[PDB]
């Protein structure tokens, strides 16, 4: 009674038994699948805490010992006394890592064990928040040799407002509306750019202005901080055989650092816990540069290549997009900033799938998200069947603080 | 009802149609399974329930709902099933149910054409020989010297007990698959077992790597018997590239007519184990899965080498460059040869239209996202950022076990 799953390219059969532990519930019924959707008490905080503890001890192969029982009785007594609880340092490391390990839409989870967890739970103000964040970037940017890190700020607690980062990423390019209904810069950031101005930012007028940070302390308005330019590593984009490419004046940042998700560990919730890895080239090349309501440079790049843009059948879209990905990959390599290509990443993901079958008897995977957005069937994940579901700890979306 | 967004526009719709879906999927609230290839695995009260279901949608379709001959049919079937344990469809009921099955095929991106489909009635077929003539006429009407035409030919229904009419082959036209001394295959590696069975039933194998198989056609209870397709019936296209002059030297080709012949057509609880249908190719089916899939013809690295690409490292995206050009050759070769084909951009753009249509006419449209998005340039097409609901309406095309 467990999902039989097949790799069709190879002929492999696994049974996802870990799915039987699916701590939460998704949007699919037997009458209808909604898999393509983008956005799908103390007795129970304890039940949430209890299980997480039982996991943490199962990991270090110390399950059901003296210290497992001591830790259990203590938490259930700290909730009883105060209404919440505190995780030990090593329970924070394990939790943050499990939340990476559990994230169904991440193709880069081969690396989950090697994450660097900065504990910022002693943080106190907006100005100090910024300090922790700059360290994060410095450590993670590492002069282009990217290291995966997560910083955790104080947990949500009754009686005190949340620490929150208002930017969706630590590094984002501005996006100004023009009178022609055109956006100069990144059209996805038109909103966050607004907020930045109405809180006092002097706006630039370029396609790649790096936005300031908006950092909110407990029960305090968000404060506007400027990242030091020297901290933000950027890659100018150029093609190895198309020299007219670099005169598009395109560039991207080195560090993908998502700052608007909520980490959830053993019932406790950390609304502000920015994490970062390194890029897969399709994210910059296809999503960021090609999407029609992103920078939307496909037709332009095609005209320069003298492809016949008058007809679909010429495949000018597909040709131009392959070359844009090529430029991305060549630029990052030239600048010695870590990048992985969709073939390498999906190849590593298959090994991850093998590791998790042996370790946990399975692995939550969201097929529609794991398959890269170009060249789907050329990768090995395409012909692999997957079971999507939800485990804890986890990274969650949360509503914008406005 | 499911609120479903087109993130490329932001448009929102509600999928009220999904509320009529009977046959349950493999998904529960605890685990999504929409990437499984065979979701739904593989007593006169139950037959009668579905039968009445199907008679009622027919009459609503033509406006004139209820009353009329509707009462007669119901009674006819009530009388029919009580008598014999089953019933027969009127020919118009069959043409209707035919199109609906197409219109409800969640994986098919070519559904805009659902209203133009040629239904051939072949329920008076009795032998394998008669089957062969019936099929030959299909291939001929369907091929039309290259200006393809949607068509389906339906054979007698599954009578209770006893053997069925059943095309053994997956498609009416396929290329043979021959093993050898290493473990490699010559021709199409997906068709080994049907080539395995044609040989051990009286076929004669071939030299090269595009040998057109015969048909193993079956009559009730009599074992299958082979039929050799007349080689002028089978229209093929040599594949050449517009600019890459050496491409044609690779000696590649694909047949014109995709004609699936191993699925089952259920209408009003009547199951037809033989019902071959055909349309025209989407270019990526030929260029991407048939030619580039690892255990298909797998020509990717040969093409990259001739293009002088660097196969040493993944980051040269050689796999991606070669693939695009193979699709360019597919398109150009079908067009020069004046055979109908559709590129994956045209098809998906028109699938969106279909979604718009189906929203007004029935308030929804079951679509399987992982099968609607083409296997290359996925995010470049308008279906990618369009959220979809998958579910199962009737009448339908369904998979069935193989006859062996
Ligand atoms: C180190 C190399 C990494 C690579 C190559 C990578 C790659 C990716 C990709 C391609 C996606 C899907 C993006 C999309 O929506 O299209 C994704 C999503 C995600 N990743 Fe990873 N990632 C990496 C590191 C990390 C780290 C360090 C974490 C957490 C600590 C993480 C957690 C997540 C989460 C939670 C999502 C879900 C966001 C969503 O719903 O799209 N990843 N990643
Ligand atoms: C006329 C142009 C047509 C085009 C371009 C087209 C295209 C496609 C494509 C690309 C698929 C997915 C193939 C795969 O990934 O396996 C598909 C699947 C399917 N189509 Fe269509 N189709 C057409 C006509 C038809 C017709 C005439 C019928 C039935 C009378 C039909 C019924 C189906 C069914 C039942 C599937 C199920 C998926 C499968 O079994 O592989 N289609 N079609
Ligand atoms: C489809 N793209 C649009 C912008 C939607 C999107 C939303 C969210 C969120 N929340 C997060 C998104 O990005 C996911 C993500 C998260 C973390 C990543 C890390 C750590 C590295 C990396 N290379 N990509 C990531 C990608 C995208
Ligand atoms: C976040 N800010 C941006 C402006 C919002 C957005 C923009 C675009 C575009 N163009 C496309 C968007 O959709 C993302 C999306 C939608 C559906 C997807 C499906 C079904 C699968 C998949 N792998 N990625 C998707 C990604 C969102
Ligand atoms: C999703 N079903 C799984 C992949 C089994 C399957 C295998 C093969 C092959 N080889 C071919 C298959 O059919 C694909 C198909 C079916 C019908 C088509 C029609 C009617 C038209 C068209 N242009 N392509 C089709 C392509 C299915
Ligand atoms: C077709 N007959 C052969 C013998 C079986 C097969 C072989 C190969 C290969 N190589 C690849 C195959 O892929 C099947 C498949 C599996 C998963 C798919 C998903 C998840 C989506 C999609 N659009 N097509 C799939 C198609 C099948
Ligand atoms: Cl990004
Ligand atoms: Cl095919
Ligand atoms: Gd050049
Ligand atoms: Gd040469
Ligand atoms: Zn996109
Ligand atoms: Zn589902
Ligand atoms: Zn394939």
Curated annotation (Swiss-Prot), chain B:
GO terms for cellular component: caveola; cytoplasm; cytoskeleton; cytosol; endocytic vesicle membrane; Golgi apparatus; Golgi membrane; nucleus. Platelets, placenta, liver and kidney. Heme b binds at residues 108, 399. Residues 31-404 are annotated as: Interaction with NOSIP. It comes from the Eukaryota. GO terms for molecular function: actin monomer binding; arginine binding; cadmium ion binding; calmodulin binding; flavin adenine dinucleotide binding; FMN binding; heme binding; NADP binding. L-arginine binds at residues 171, 280-281, 285, 290. (6R)-L-erythro-5,6,7,8-tetrahydrobiopterin binds at residues 35, 289, 370-371, 384. Zn(2+) binds at residues 27, 32. It is found in: Cell membrane; Membrane, Caveola; Cytoplasm, Cytoskeleton; Golgi apparatus. One of its GO terms (biological process) is response to lipopolysaccharide. Keywords: Calcium, Calmodulin-binding, Cell membrane, Cytoplasm, Cytoskeleton, FAD, Flavoprotein, FMN, Golgi apparatus, Heme, Iron, Lipoprotein, Membrane, Metal-binding, Myristate, NADP, Oxidoreductase, Palmitate, Phosphoprotein, Zinc. Produces nitric oxide (NO) which is implicated in vascular smooth muscle relaxation through a cGMP-mediated signal transduction pathway. NO mediates vascular endothelial growth factor (VEGF)-induced angiogenesis in coronary vessels and promotes blood clotting through the activation of platelets. Homodimer. Interacts with NOSIP and NOSTRIN. Interacts with HSP90AB1. Forms a complex with ASL, ASS1 and SLC7A1; the complex regulates cell-autonomous L-arginine synthesis and citrulline recycling while channeling extracellular L-arginine to nitric oxide synthesis pathway. Belongs to the NOS family. This is Nitric oxide synthase 3. It comes from Homo sapiens (Human). The chain holds residues 68 to 480 of 1203 of the full protein.
